[PDB]
């Protein structure tokens, strides 16, 4: 009984471009919320001052062109669609230190155009040491995310949460996570430029104690 999911798919995509920002009117902004879930601290390189982190990135937004009437599809109200088929906001890690592989994913598309996209990621980024605050062996590792393609009048980005999600991550032997607070920064240039937003997570690491 996937008959309806196929009908929907064929219907949604008869005339649909994954290159067109999916708003009904071009001067409307499209908002995206971002949540970062830390999965593991793969490597803290103190020689290069580079953090390698494994994350889950969750992006949520509305697509104006991918809606449908549940009644016309035997109640079907959600479908999983390869992510390459839909327009995406092109949110990437701005402060990559890296070179810098792909891994394919699906989005969940709800009948009201709401797209939820969970995708794994590996980030390499530079960190700054601090030995001012206890235990005097710490790292401040910023991760800054933003659209590579769109300015803030086109795509505006927001934190879903006050901080990165640290509920479940593999945990590193040398470094403890002290926090990962999130902020949003919007920069505009000179008197009159378009805005350029990002969200930044500051992962605060402190050297693990092995004493007591």
Ligand X SMILES: *[C@@H]1O[C@H](CO)[C@@H](O)[C@H](O)[C@H]1NC(C)=O
| φ, ψ at 33 (rounded to 5°) | -100, 145
CA distance 28 to 71: 29
CB of 94 to ligand X, least distance (A): 11
Two tokens, residue 80: 């999983």
Considering only the stretches 23-31, 66-74, 84-92, 108-116, report the one whose residues sit in contact with ligand X under the rule CB under 6 A: 23-31
Stretch that binds ligand X, among 25-33, 117-125, 147-155, 160-168 (CB under 6 A): 25-33
- Residues 152-171, one symbol each (x = binds ligand X by CB under 6 A, - = not), give --------------------
Given the rule CB under 6 A, which of 9-17, 26-34, 85-93, 168-176 is the region that contacts ligand X?
26-34
How buried is residue 66: exposed, middle or buried, by Cβ count under 10 Å (0-12/13-18/19+)? buried
Nearer to ligand X (CB atom), residue 31 or residue 193: 31
Contact 53, 41 (CB under 8 A): yes
> Is 45 annotated to bind ligand?
no
How many residues in the shown chain lie near ligand X by CB under 6 A? Answer: 10
83 is in an annotated binding site: no
Query: Given candidates 185, 188, 194, 195, which one binds ligand X under the rule CB under 6 A?
Result: 185
Report how far residue 164's alpha carbon sits from residue 19's, in angstroms, rounded to the nearest whole number. 30
Cα–Cα distances in angstroms (integers) from residue 77 to residues 1, 11, 70, in the given order: 14, 14, 6
**Close Cβ partners of 158 (under 8 Å, ≥ 6 residues apart):** 31, 32, 33, 34, 184, 199
Q: For residues 26 and 167, which CB has a smaller minimum distance to ligand X in the complex?
A: 26
Phi first, then psi: give them for residue 190, nearest 5 degrees.
Answer: 65, -150
Tell whether residue 20 is a contact of ligand X (CB under 6 A): no
- Would you state the structure tokens that stand for residue 90, as one six-digit string? 């092109």
- Interactions with ligand X, residue window 68-97 (CB under 6 A): none
Write the CB contacts of 131 (distance below 8 Å, at least 6 apart in sequence): 137, 138
Interface positions, 28-67, toward ligand X (CB under 6 A): 28-29, 31
Annotated binding site: 163, 165
Kindly list the residues in this chain that would bind ligand X in the complex (CB under 6 A): 28-29, 31, 128, 140, 142, 183, 185, 200, 202
User: Can you say which residues are annotated as belonging to the binding site for Na(+)?
Assistant: 163, 165
């Amino acid at each position: 009984d996937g008959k309806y999911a196929q009908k929907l798919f064929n219907d949604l995509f008869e005339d649909y471009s994954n290159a067109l920002r999916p708003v009904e009117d071009t001067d409307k902004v499209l908002n995206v919320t971002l949540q970062i879930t830390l999965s593991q601290i793969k490597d803290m390189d103190e020689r290069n001052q580079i953090l390698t982190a494994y994350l889950w990135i969750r992006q949520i937004w509305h697509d104006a062109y991918l809606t449908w009437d549940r009644d016309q599809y035997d109640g079907l109200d959600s479908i999983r669609i390869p992510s390459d088929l839909v327009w995406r906001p092109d949110i990437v890690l701005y402060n990559k230190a890296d070179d810098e592989e792909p891994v394919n994913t699906n989005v969940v598309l709800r009948y009201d155009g709401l797209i939820t996209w969970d995708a794994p990621a590996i980030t390499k980024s530079s960190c700054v040491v601090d030995v001012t605050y206890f235990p005097f062996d710490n790292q401040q590792c910023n991760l800054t995310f933003g659209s590579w393609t769109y300015n803030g009048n086109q795509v505006d980005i927001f934190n879903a949460l006050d901080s990165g999600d640290l509920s479940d991550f593999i945990e590193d032997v040398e470094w403890e996570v002290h926090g990962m607070p999130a902020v949003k920064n919007v920069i505009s240039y000179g008197c009159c430029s378009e805005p350029y937003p990002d969200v930044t997570f500051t992962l605060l690491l402190k050297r693990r104690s092995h004493h007591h």
